[PDB]
């Protein structure tokens, strides 16, 4: 029981993560060679990684009943990566229980009305547990079309360097070297 005795404040705090839909991802890409062919994370592969963060399943203290999720700010949703002809041949459906009222729309037509942010929300939405926490977790997905967003000051930092910035890693390793000067 000792493992759980302590300050659980920071384990349950909400962290503001960030990812760009245009930056190549060596991990979430199907192409790994040459490095110049590494693509960004596809629509569904990005949504599978985001749904894991919204659930907090990446934390060692995860529990499905507790809402221990985090925020995910996604930018550049206009250049969302897709393979094949999904952009023009995929269709989204809608029905309001009235026979004849079937609403269909393609991805390229849906990206013109509500941008690529709505295409990423429907993907993440379907990857979340179908329960009473689905709307809270999905609401923590901040998707934007360009590089601008109102959370440039919320993104997690380590020594003033936002995670994903050029020199955020060396800023983290420099803070852990000082933590070893103690019993």
């Amino acid at each position: 029981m000792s493992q759980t005795v302590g300050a659980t404040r920071l384990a349950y705090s909400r962290v503001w993560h960030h990812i760009s839909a245009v930056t190549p991802h060596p991990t979430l890409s199907t192409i790994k060679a040459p490095s110049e062919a590494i693509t960004p994370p596809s629509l569904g592969r990005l949504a599978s990684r985001i749904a894991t963060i919204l659930m907090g399943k990446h934390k060692p203290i995860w529990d499905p009943s507790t809402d221990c999720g985090d925020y995910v700010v996604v930018t550049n949703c206009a250049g969302l990566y897709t393979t094949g002809h999904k952009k023009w041949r995929k269709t989204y459906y809608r029905h309001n229980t009235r026979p004849g009222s079937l609403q269909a729309i393609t991805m390229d037509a849906l990206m013109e009305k509500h941008g690529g942010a709505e295409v990423l929300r429907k993907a993440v939405s379907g990857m979340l547990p179908k329960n009473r926490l689905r709307d809270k977790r999905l609401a923590r997905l901040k998707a934007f079309e360009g590089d601008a967003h109102p959370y440039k000051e919320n993104l997690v930092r380590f020594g003033g360097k936002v995670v994903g910035a050029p020199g955020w890693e060396e800023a983290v390793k420099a803070i852990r070297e000082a933590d070893m000067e103690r019993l």
């Binding site: 989204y92 709505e118 429907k122 079309e145």
Partner: protein, 307 residues
Amino acid sequence: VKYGWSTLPKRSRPTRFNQVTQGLPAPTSGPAAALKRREKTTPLRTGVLAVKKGMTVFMGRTGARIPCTVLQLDRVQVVANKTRAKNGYWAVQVGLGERRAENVGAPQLGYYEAKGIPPKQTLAEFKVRNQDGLLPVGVQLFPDWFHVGQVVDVRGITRGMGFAGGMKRHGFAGQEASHGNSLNHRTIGSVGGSQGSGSRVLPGKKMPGRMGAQQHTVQNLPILMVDNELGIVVVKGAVAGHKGAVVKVQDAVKKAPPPEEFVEATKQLLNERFPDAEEKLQAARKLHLELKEARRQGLIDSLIKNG
């Protein structure tokens, strides 16, 4: 979803962070796209609030007999202007009639206090095409705002009819009268199909209910007469509502706007009948701050009986 395709929360405000100047595509939705796909139909000028005063015929000097409705203008003023930078669309707010100060609430008494206009009876917005359709606040609109022969669209609330059956509301034919029919002469009959059709009554099924008392538009109605003294605008045809009800009159959307000379002549007549429209408005706005800050401090009585 809750409305349409968007699953966005109803408290988020990301619009200002999606700008086309950043190289993004112009959305097909929003106030900018909506105003653009209605540019040709949106009128150029504003409308007027008129009262339906009855119906007659217009007799021509050669044999014409045209049924027409009489619409009277009762102290129609310009109360406010809706800009695209403050509200998201162009429109002019128009007033009608008067009202007792005691019957007007405090929120609206201070609303007119900052404009120099007496309390009105009814308010209504008339959308315009661009900023050229905005008029000075505190100018009266007369029947000469239109010209004889101009076609307009009249918008009013129809006559109420309470709970209506299926015959009056939806034009159902009813059933037989004497060939054995049993208690089902004016009934609606079958309400739908059986198990194969859904085991339910489908949405949108036409059924009895309340009728009337809703807005209705009649388009492309010429103006036969224009008299400023009486304050009437005789239009051809019928108009929705009862006598004494307020209606909205504006240029037809399915027609070409009036000539440029007319749109300018009318605008040029407001500067002559009311040469002091900004001086009286700024003066009324300046007094609002004095009285507003007097109410805050609690010294409002010092100004009422100041003289």
